[PDB]
Amino acid sequence: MSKGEELFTGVVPILVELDGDVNGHKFSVRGEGEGDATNGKLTLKFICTTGKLPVPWPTLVTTLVQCFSRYPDHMKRHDFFKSAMPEGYVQERTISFKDDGTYKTRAEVKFEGDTLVNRIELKGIDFKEDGNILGHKLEYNLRVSTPRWERIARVLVCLLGILLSLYAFHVEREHARDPSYKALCDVSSSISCSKVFGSRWGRGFGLLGSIFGNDSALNQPNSVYGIVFYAFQLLLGMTVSAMAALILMTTSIMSVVGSLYLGYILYFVLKDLCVICVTTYALNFILFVLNYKRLVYLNEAWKQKLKQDNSHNVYITADKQKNGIKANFKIRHNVEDGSVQLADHYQQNTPIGDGPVLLPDNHYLSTQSVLSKDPNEKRDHMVLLEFVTAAGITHGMDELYKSNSLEVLFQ
User: Fold this and answer.
1) Are the C-beta atoms of 310 and 368 separated by less than 8 Å?
2) Which InterPro entries match?
3) 277 assigned ligand-binding residue
4) Is 222 annotated as a binding-site member?
Protein backbone atom coordinates (compact mmCIF):
# COMPACT_ATOMS: atom_id res chain seq x y z
CA MET A 1 0.00 0.00 0.00
CA SER A 2 1.65 3.12 -1.42
CA LYS A 3 3.05 4.66 -4.56
CA GLY A 4 6.32 3.35 -3.14
CA GLU A 5 5.39 -0.33 -3.31
CA GLU A 6 4.72 0.07 -7.04
CA LEU A 7 8.38 1.12 -7.33
CA PHE A 8 9.62 -2.32 -6.19
CA THR A 9 7.70 -4.58 -8.58
CA GLY A 10 10.81 -5.49 -10.60
CA VAL A 11 14.60 -5.41 -10.33
CA VAL A 12 15.97 -2.14 -8.93
CA PRO A 13 19.63 -1.08 -9.26
CA ILE A 14 21.34 -0.36 -5.95
CA LEU A 15 24.18 2.03 -5.11
CA VAL A 16 25.73 2.23 -1.62
CA GLU A 17 28.34 4.74 -0.45
CA LEU A 18 29.88 4.80 3.03
CA ASP A 19 32.39 7.08 4.73
CA GLY A 20 33.67 5.72 8.02
CA ASP A 21 35.94 6.69 10.91
CA VAL A 22 36.84 3.95 13.40
CA ASN A 23 39.27 5.04 16.15
CA GLY A 24 40.64 7.69 13.81
CA HIS A 25 40.96 5.39 10.79
CA LYS A 26 39.07 6.85 7.82
CA PHE A 27 37.82 4.64 5.01
CA SER A 28 35.40 4.65 2.09
CA VAL A 29 33.25 1.78 0.83
CA ARG A 30 31.40 1.76 -2.50
CA GLY A 31 28.99 -1.02 -3.39
CA GLU A 32 26.68 -1.64 -6.32
CA GLY A 33 24.18 -4.30 -7.29
CA GLU A 34 20.49 -4.97 -7.63
CA GLY A 35 17.50 -5.85 -5.49
CA ASP A 36 14.33 -7.86 -6.06
CA ALA A 37 11.67 -7.09 -3.45
CA THR A 38 9.31 -9.75 -4.83
CA ASN A 39 11.81 -12.42 -3.72
CA GLY A 40 13.37 -10.32 -0.95
CA LYS A 41 16.71 -10.88 -2.69
CA LEU A 42 19.76 -8.61 -2.61
CA THR A 43 22.79 -9.10 -4.87
CA LEU A 44 25.56 -6.63 -4.07
CA LYS A 45 29.32 -6.13 -4.31
CA PHE A 46 31.25 -3.74 -2.05
CA ILE A 47 34.83 -2.51 -2.42
CA CYS A 48 37.00 -0.47 -0.06
CA THR A 49 38.20 2.42 -2.23
CA THR A 50 40.83 3.51 0.35
CA GLY A 51 43.00 0.40 0.58
CA LYS A 52 42.59 -2.17 3.35
CA LEU A 53 39.55 -2.17 5.62
CA PRO A 54 40.21 -1.38 9.31
CA VAL A 55 37.19 -3.38 10.53
CA PRO A 56 35.94 -6.84 9.54
CA TRP A 57 33.48 -6.91 6.66
CA PRO A 58 30.77 -8.79 8.65
CA THR A 59 30.60 -5.85 11.08
CA LEU A 60 29.46 -3.59 8.21
CA VAL A 61 26.72 -5.79 6.70
CA THR A 62 23.88 -4.34 8.78
CA THR A 63 25.12 -0.81 8.07
CA LEU A 64 25.61 -1.34 4.33
CA VAL A 65 18.29 -1.13 2.53
CA GLN A 66 15.37 -2.90 4.19
CA CYS A 67 13.01 -1.49 1.54
CA PHE A 68 13.85 -4.63 -0.46
CA SER A 69 12.41 -6.94 2.20
CA ARG A 70 9.65 -9.23 0.94
CA TYR A 71 6.43 -8.32 2.75
CA PRO A 72 3.60 -10.87 2.38
CA ASP A 73 0.29 -9.42 1.23
CA HIS A 74 -1.28 -9.82 4.69
CA MET A 75 1.52 -7.70 6.19
CA LYS A 76 1.77 -5.18 3.35
CA ARG A 77 0.11 -2.46 5.44
CA HIS A 78 3.05 -2.80 7.86
CA ASP A 79 5.82 -1.94 5.35
CA PHE A 80 7.18 1.45 6.40
CA PHE A 81 10.27 1.36 4.17
CA LYS A 82 8.47 1.20 0.82
CA SER A 83 5.79 3.70 1.88
CA ALA A 84 8.46 6.37 2.41
CA MET A 85 9.65 6.04 -1.20
CA PRO A 86 10.61 7.67 -3.49
CA GLU A 87 11.45 10.45 -1.02
CA GLY A 88 13.12 7.85 1.19
CA TYR A 89 13.96 7.71 4.87
CA VAL A 90 16.80 8.48 7.27
CA GLN A 91 18.09 5.42 9.15
CA GLU A 92 20.15 5.99 12.31
CA ARG A 93 21.79 3.19 14.29
CA THR A 94 23.87 2.72 17.43
CA ILE A 95 25.68 -0.64 17.51
CA SER A 96 27.31 -1.60 20.82
CA PHE A 97 29.93 -4.34 20.55
CA LYS A 98 30.12 -6.05 23.94
CA ASP A 99 33.37 -5.33 25.81
CA ASP A 100 34.43 -3.28 22.77
CA GLY A 101 33.66 -0.08 20.85
CA THR A 102 30.50 1.34 19.33
CA TYR A 103 29.29 2.23 15.83
CA LYS A 104 27.23 5.36 15.22
CA THR A 105 25.70 5.39 11.74
CA ARG A 106 23.44 7.87 9.96
CA ALA A 107 22.21 7.00 6.47
CA GLU A 108 19.87 8.39 3.82
CA VAL A 109 18.00 5.83 1.71
CA LYS A 110 16.22 7.39 -1.26
CA PHE A 111 15.55 7.00 -4.97
CA GLU A 112 17.81 8.85 -7.41
CA GLY A 113 16.33 8.40 -10.87
CA ASP A 114 16.20 4.64 -11.37
CA THR A 115 18.73 3.74 -8.65
CA LEU A 116 18.00 3.07 -4.99
CA VAL A 117 20.79 4.96 -3.21
CA ASN A 118 21.93 4.44 0.40
CA ARG A 119 24.48 7.03 1.56
CA ILE A 120 26.01 6.28 4.95
CA GLU A 121 28.16 8.18 7.45
CA LEU A 122 29.72 5.95 10.10
CA LYS A 123 31.94 6.53 13.12
CA GLY A 124 33.30 3.90 15.50
CA ILE A 125 34.64 4.79 18.95
CA ASP A 126 36.33 3.15 21.94
CA PHE A 127 37.47 0.04 20.06
CA LYS A 128 40.24 -2.11 21.52
CA GLU A 129 43.41 -2.39 19.46
CA ASP A 130 43.60 -6.15 20.14
CA GLY A 131 39.85 -6.72 20.29
CA ASN A 132 37.84 -8.92 17.97
CA ILE A 133 37.07 -5.99 15.64
CA LEU A 134 40.32 -4.05 15.22
CA GLY A 135 42.22 -7.34 15.51
CA HIS A 136 40.30 -8.89 12.59
CA LYS A 137 39.46 -12.03 14.58
CA LEU A 138 35.88 -12.45 13.33
CA GLU A 139 34.88 -15.15 10.87
CA TYR A 140 33.91 -14.10 7.34
CA ASN A 141 30.22 -14.98 7.54
CA LEU A 142 26.99 -14.21 9.39
CA ARG A 143 25.98 -17.78 10.22
CA VAL A 144 24.07 -18.92 13.30
CA SER A 145 26.10 -21.62 15.05
CA THR A 146 23.16 -23.48 16.58
CA PRO A 147 19.64 -23.47 15.10
CA ARG A 148 17.33 -21.08 16.90
CA TRP A 149 14.61 -23.61 17.79
CA GLU A 150 17.20 -25.78 19.54
CA ARG A 151 18.37 -22.82 21.63
CA ILE A 152 14.79 -21.87 22.56
CA ALA A 153 13.83 -25.47 23.33
CA ARG A 154 17.00 -25.94 25.38
CA VAL A 155 16.49 -22.86 27.54
CA LEU A 156 12.81 -23.73 28.01
CA VAL A 157 13.43 -27.35 29.03
CA CYS A 158 16.28 -26.29 31.31
CA LEU A 159 14.19 -23.54 32.93
CA LEU A 160 11.25 -25.87 33.55
CA GLY A 161 13.69 -28.44 34.91
CA ILE A 162 15.14 -25.93 37.36
CA LEU A 163 11.66 -24.89 38.49
CA LEU A 164 10.50 -28.49 38.98
CA SER A 165 13.75 -29.27 40.82
CA LEU A 166 13.25 -26.28 43.13
CA TYR A 167 9.64 -27.28 43.80
CA ALA A 168 10.63 -30.89 44.51
CA PHE A 169 13.28 -29.56 46.90
CA HIS A 170 10.64 -27.40 48.60
CA VAL A 171 8.35 -30.41 49.03
CA GLU A 172 11.22 -32.52 50.38
CA ARG A 173 12.16 -29.85 52.93
CA GLU A 174 8.83 -28.34 54.04
CA HIS A 175 6.18 -30.91 53.08
CA ALA A 176 7.36 -34.52 53.04
CA ARG A 177 7.96 -34.96 56.79
CA ASP A 178 4.53 -33.86 58.01
CA PRO A 179 1.99 -36.59 58.84
CA SER A 180 -0.81 -34.53 57.28
CA TYR A 181 1.14 -34.89 54.03
CA LYS A 182 0.84 -38.68 54.28
CA ALA A 183 -2.83 -38.49 55.30
CA LEU A 184 -3.71 -36.00 52.54
CA CYS A 185 -1.83 -37.90 49.82
CA ASP A 186 -3.61 -41.16 50.66
CA VAL A 187 -6.95 -39.47 49.85
CA SER A 188 -6.07 -36.87 47.18
CA SER A 189 -4.31 -36.81 43.81
CA SER A 190 -1.91 -33.85 43.88
CA ILE A 191 1.20 -32.90 41.93
CA SER A 192 2.94 -32.48 45.31
CA CYS A 193 2.10 -36.07 46.34
CA SER A 194 4.78 -38.73 45.83
CA LYS A 195 6.21 -41.55 47.93
CA VAL A 196 9.81 -41.08 46.76
CA PHE A 197 10.50 -37.84 48.66
CA GLY A 198 10.44 -39.50 52.07
CA SER A 199 12.00 -42.71 50.78
CA ARG A 200 15.30 -44.49 50.19
CA TRP A 201 15.60 -43.10 46.65
CA GLY A 202 14.90 -39.51 47.71
CA ARG A 203 18.56 -38.99 48.64
CA GLY A 204 21.19 -39.73 46.01
CA PHE A 205 18.76 -41.77 43.88
CA GLY A 206 18.98 -44.59 46.43
CA LEU A 207 22.48 -45.62 45.35
CA LEU A 208 25.75 -43.64 45.73
CA GLY A 209 24.86 -43.82 49.40
CA SER A 210 26.51 -46.83 51.04
CA ILE A 211 28.74 -46.32 48.01
CA PHE A 212 29.71 -43.16 49.91
CA GLY A 213 29.32 -42.59 53.66
CA ASN A 214 25.50 -42.28 53.30
CA ASP A 215 25.79 -39.14 55.44
CA SER A 216 28.33 -37.41 53.18
CA ALA A 217 27.83 -34.16 51.30
CA LEU A 218 27.81 -36.03 47.97
CA ASN A 219 24.61 -37.87 48.97
CA GLN A 220 22.08 -35.08 48.46
CA PRO A 221 18.36 -35.20 47.64
CA ASN A 222 17.68 -35.78 43.96
CA SER A 223 16.29 -32.25 43.51
CA VAL A 224 19.78 -30.86 44.18
CA TYR A 225 21.20 -32.97 41.35
CA GLY A 226 18.24 -31.62 39.37
CA ILE A 227 19.11 -27.95 39.87
CA VAL A 228 22.82 -28.64 39.28
CA PHE A 229 22.21 -30.71 36.15
CA TYR A 230 19.70 -28.38 34.49
CA ALA A 231 21.63 -25.21 35.33
CA PHE A 232 24.81 -26.93 34.11
CA GLN A 233 23.10 -28.00 30.88
CA LEU A 234 21.84 -24.43 30.47
CA LEU A 235 25.13 -22.60 31.04
CA LEU A 236 27.12 -25.08 28.95
CA GLY A 237 24.39 -25.09 26.31
CA MET A 238 25.24 -21.42 25.74
CA THR A 239 28.70 -22.48 24.52
CA VAL A 240 28.96 -24.17 21.12
CA SER A 241 32.05 -26.39 21.26
CA ALA A 242 32.97 -30.01 20.62
CA MET A 243 34.10 -30.30 24.25
CA ALA A 244 30.86 -28.79 25.55
CA ALA A 245 28.78 -30.99 23.24
CA LEU A 246 30.56 -34.13 24.45
CA ILE A 247 30.11 -33.19 28.11
CA LEU A 248 26.41 -32.37 27.62
CA MET A 249 25.94 -35.66 25.78
CA THR A 250 27.55 -37.68 28.59
CA THR A 251 25.51 -35.90 31.28
CA SER A 252 22.33 -36.45 29.25
CA ILE A 253 23.04 -40.18 28.95
CA MET A 254 23.57 -40.33 32.72
CA SER A 255 20.26 -38.47 33.12
CA VAL A 256 18.33 -40.90 30.92
CA VAL A 257 19.78 -44.03 32.56
CA GLY A 258 18.99 -42.52 35.96
CA SER A 259 15.48 -41.72 34.74
CA LEU A 260 15.03 -45.31 33.59
CA TYR A 261 16.27 -46.58 36.96
CA LEU A 262 14.04 -44.37 39.11
CA GLY A 263 11.16 -45.03 36.71
CA TYR A 264 11.61 -48.77 37.16
CA ILE A 265 11.53 -48.15 40.92
CA LEU A 266 8.44 -45.97 40.45
CA TYR A 267 6.43 -48.63 38.61
CA PHE A 268 7.55 -51.92 40.18
CA VAL A 269 9.45 -51.79 43.49
CA LEU A 270 7.74 -48.64 44.84
CA LYS A 271 4.26 -48.85 43.34
CA ASP A 272 2.89 -45.30 43.01
CA LEU A 273 2.71 -42.35 40.61
CA CYS A 274 4.86 -39.21 40.69
CA VAL A 275 3.96 -36.49 38.19
CA ILE A 276 7.06 -34.42 38.99
CA CYS A 277 9.31 -37.44 38.44
CA VAL A 278 7.74 -38.41 35.11
CA THR A 279 7.85 -34.81 33.89
CA THR A 280 11.55 -34.54 34.76
CA TYR A 281 12.13 -37.83 32.93
CA ALA A 282 10.50 -36.34 29.83
CA LEU A 283 12.70 -33.25 30.17
CA ASN A 284 15.82 -35.41 30.45
CA PHE A 285 14.77 -37.28 27.30
CA ILE A 286 14.25 -33.98 25.48
CA LEU A 287 17.68 -32.71 26.53
CA PHE A 288 19.11 -36.04 25.36
CA VAL A 289 17.52 -35.59 21.92
CA LEU A 290 18.70 -31.97 21.73
CA ASN A 291 22.30 -32.87 22.59
CA TYR A 292 22.29 -35.73 20.08
CA LYS A 293 20.93 -33.30 17.48
CA ARG A 294 23.69 -30.82 18.32
CA LEU A 295 26.36 -33.48 17.76
CA VAL A 296 24.77 -34.67 14.50
CA TYR A 297 24.62 -31.06 13.30
CA LEU A 298 28.23 -30.59 14.40
CA ASN A 299 29.31 -33.49 12.17
CA GLU A 300 26.97 -33.07 9.16
CA ALA A 301 26.34 -29.31 8.94
CA TRP A 302 28.82 -29.15 6.05
CA LYS A 303 26.63 -31.58 4.09
CA GLN A 304 23.45 -29.80 5.20
CA LYS A 305 24.69 -26.45 3.86
CA LEU A 306 22.68 -27.49 0.79
CA LYS A 307 19.42 -26.16 4.18
CA GLN A 308 20.80 -24.12 7.08
CA ASP A 309 18.64 -21.38 8.58
CA ASN A 310 21.27 -18.73 9.42
CA SER A 311 18.48 -16.16 9.84
CA HIS A 312 18.60 -13.10 12.11
CA ASN A 313 15.36 -11.39 13.14
CA VAL A 314 15.29 -7.60 13.38
CA TYR A 315 12.42 -6.50 15.62
CA ILE A 316 10.39 -3.50 14.43
CA THR A 317 7.91 -1.43 16.44
CA ALA A 318 6.12 1.78 15.52
CA ASP A 319 7.28 5.27 16.57
CA LYS A 320 4.29 7.59 16.22
CA GLN A 321 5.95 10.54 17.98
CA LYS A 322 8.48 10.78 15.13
CA ASN A 323 6.24 9.35 12.34
CA GLY A 324 8.79 6.56 11.90
CA ILE A 325 9.80 3.20 13.30
CA LYS A 326 12.23 1.78 15.84
CA ALA A 327 14.06 -1.53 15.60
CA ASN A 328 16.24 -3.61 17.91
CA PHE A 329 18.19 -6.81 17.34
CA LYS A 330 21.38 -8.63 18.30
CA ILE A 331 23.99 -10.07 15.92
CA ARG A 332 26.31 -12.80 17.23
CA HIS A 333 29.58 -12.77 15.28
CA ASN A 334 31.57 -15.99 15.55
CA VAL A 335 35.18 -15.51 16.63
CA GLU A 336 37.97 -17.65 15.19
CA ASP A 337 38.99 -19.10 18.57
CA GLY A 338 35.44 -20.33 19.24
CA SER A 339 34.12 -17.40 21.27
CA VAL A 340 31.25 -15.07 20.33
CA GLN A 341 31.26 -11.29 19.83
CA LEU A 342 27.87 -9.74 20.57
CA ALA A 343 26.53 -6.71 18.69
CA ASP A 344 23.54 -4.77 20.05
CA HIS A 345 21.66 -2.94 17.29
CA TYR A 346 19.45 0.03 18.19
CA GLN A 347 17.79 1.58 15.15
CA GLN A 348 15.37 4.37 14.23
CA ASN A 349 13.93 5.33 10.84
CA THR A 350 12.18 8.60 10.00
CA PRO A 351 10.67 9.63 6.65
CA ILE A 352 12.50 12.28 4.63
CA GLY A 353 9.51 13.70 2.75
CA ASP A 354 5.99 14.68 3.78
CA GLY A 355 3.71 11.85 2.72
CA PRO A 356 1.50 9.10 4.14
CA VAL A 357 3.81 6.51 5.72
CA LEU A 358 2.74 3.16 7.15
CA LEU A 359 3.13 2.84 10.92
CA PRO A 360 3.31 -0.93 11.52
CA ASP A 361 2.36 -3.28 14.29
CA ASN A 362 5.21 -5.04 16.07
CA HIS A 363 6.77 -7.50 13.63
CA TYR A 364 10.20 -8.67 12.53
CA LEU A 365 12.32 -9.22 9.44
CA SER A 366 14.05 -12.57 8.94
CA THR A 367 17.39 -11.84 7.26
CA GLN A 368 19.83 -14.35 5.77
CA SER A 369 23.24 -13.25 4.52
CA VAL A 370 25.86 -15.03 2.41
CA LEU A 371 29.34 -13.49 2.19
CA SER A 372 31.77 -14.46 -0.56
CA LYS A 373 34.69 -13.14 -2.60
CA ASP A 374 35.29 -12.17 -6.22
CA PRO A 375 38.48 -13.90 -7.45
CA ASN A 376 38.78 -11.21 -10.15
CA GLU A 377 38.73 -8.35 -7.61
CA LYS A 378 42.18 -7.36 -6.32
CA ARG A 379 40.86 -4.72 -3.91
CA ASP A 380 39.53 -5.37 -0.42
CA HIS A 381 35.94 -6.29 -1.18
CA MET A 382 32.90 -8.32 -0.15
CA VAL A 383 30.23 -10.08 -2.23
CA LEU A 384 26.87 -10.14 -0.47
CA LEU A 385 23.72 -12.17 -1.17
CA GLU A 386 20.76 -11.39 1.10
CA PHE A 387 17.28 -12.86 1.64
CA VAL A 388 14.91 -10.79 3.80
CA THR A 389 11.28 -11.65 4.51
CA ALA A 390 8.83 -10.07 6.95
CA ALA A 391 7.11 -12.25 9.54
CA GLY A 392 5.43 -12.28 12.94
CA ILE A 393 1.72 -11.68 12.17
CA THR A 394 -0.86 -14.37 11.35
CA HIS A 395 -4.27 -15.53 12.57
CA GLY A 396 -3.79 -19.29 12.88
CA MET A 397 -2.36 -21.19 15.83
CA ASP A 398 -0.59 -23.85 13.74
CA GLU A 399 2.23 -21.33 13.26
CA LEU A 400 2.15 -19.52 16.61
CA TYR A 401 5.80 -20.05 17.58
CA LYS A 402 6.49 -17.72 14.62
CA SER A 403 4.52 -14.84 16.17
CA ASN A 404 6.43 -11.72 17.18
CA SER A 405 5.21 -11.92 20.79
CA LEU A 406 7.09 -15.22 21.22
CA GLU A 407 10.16 -14.44 19.09
CA VAL A 408 11.10 -11.27 21.01
CA LEU A 409 11.54 -13.20 24.26
CA PHE A 410 14.33 -15.34 22.73
CA GLN A 411 16.96 -13.03 21.23
Assistant:
1) yes
2) GFP, GFP-related, Green_fluorescent_prot
3) yes
4) yes
